[PDB]
Amino acid sequence: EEDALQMAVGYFEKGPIKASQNKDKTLEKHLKTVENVAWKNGLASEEIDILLNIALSGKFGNAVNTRILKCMIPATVISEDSVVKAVSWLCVGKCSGSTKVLFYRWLVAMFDFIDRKEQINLLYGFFFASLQDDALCPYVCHLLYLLTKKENVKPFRVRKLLDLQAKMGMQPHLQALLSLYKFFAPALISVIYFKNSENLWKTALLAVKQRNRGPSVLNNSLLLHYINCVRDEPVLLRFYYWLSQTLQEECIWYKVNNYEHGKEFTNFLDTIIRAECFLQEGFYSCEAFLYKSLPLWDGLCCRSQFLQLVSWIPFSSFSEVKPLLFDHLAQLFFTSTIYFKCSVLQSLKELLQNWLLWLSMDIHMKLGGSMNSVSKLIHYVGWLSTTAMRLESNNTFLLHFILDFYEKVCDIYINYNLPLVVLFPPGIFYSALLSLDTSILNQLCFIMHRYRKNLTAAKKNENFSSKTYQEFNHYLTSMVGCLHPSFLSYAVSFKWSWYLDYLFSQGLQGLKLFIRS
């Protein structure tokens, strides 16, 4: 009946209100109760916004009383905007400026629901030339802030906005439009923010939302994929120089606060760390800042961030990176507590993976001198991790992280296709063999079982063989005869096969992988 009722309203417009036998506000108010349910179909919204607002009865109260609720049920269509731009014709009838204010507020509030916003954008100048009149500027500014595309930023419009700014005030709406025009082709330069006033309409417009429901590059994850894919010269250098001068200036920022600046630097180094974990190669300013700031470094100043930066260090030689960095990750490793000690063999644990990834595809993209680098890194950690074992009187926490490093040394051949089976230095092997807990004992057992698996796999494809097999049979005969204190703890808590089952069943999985082997 609304289509019939709205054509009756049009008849109420083809004739005067006085000549009508019934009131408009009665029938239009029945339509208003309908709007409280569903205000205007796309065709209905079109027509009732067209004829009620061009010239006809459309009282600046009545046309507004509808215009407060003359929005759309499904979506507003182009033909709605078409001849209401002929209500924007703004002439003998003009739908005088108050109803113009509610009309441009209509468009601002329902800019989100148009099928083809490009059509209205193609109508950009028709509303841009409506910016000159004073009453619609606070609302037309919002509308063009919502309508603006690069094709609509012709320099004459830039000069018109500048003329409007000079003639009129510094009004924040003009500033917002100027911000967009600066975001596009910068023929103008300037340095509130979509704070809307349709909130009163957003009773009805929130109903409309519910009705539709029912009826330089680090902080850009979508752009980080580009730099991930371009190993180009002027972009990895445009980016290196920013990282070096951000990790210098904002780290000199420590020397003046060291407490409150120690939270944005931590949260910026976290973004660097995440960008490297995604992009997967160490930023060439990440190491260059590390060699510069490792000797000066303390134990706990951004430890969680600095020792994740070490992980992403472009594999260099372990003869040019050892003296520069690893001679300081031993200068602090041997002087700091366990809680920094475990944070280095973990840091170098992740460094080992981030070097072995880049070596796996060095096999994929077609060695020996690269081989000697990871082998020497592991031995130097294996040198690091026998004397850290001695500093802390065989602390089980530290050796747990040591094995966590070595949990990624057993599986070099199986995981990374690298023939680099490096066995335990005995200062860890027997120190965990004759250790006193099983969460470290089964850890060692898992590592050596993966060592058996990796050595057997290396025997298939092929110094390692002679001395490495000798050392692993040493670690075998000594230990397989030894396979005991934490097992004694279990036995006290506790028929050999049943003892096994009591084991095995109770989480001893590294022991399972050995015993099955």
Binding site: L300, R303, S304, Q305, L307, Q308, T337, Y339, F340, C342, S343, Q346, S347
Partner: peptide, 12 residues
């Protein structure tokens, strides 16, 4: 991480 965690057992 276990580095951000290892910085809060140093304190705690």
């Amino acid at each position: 991480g276990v580095l951000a965690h290892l910085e809060r057992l140093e304190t705690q």
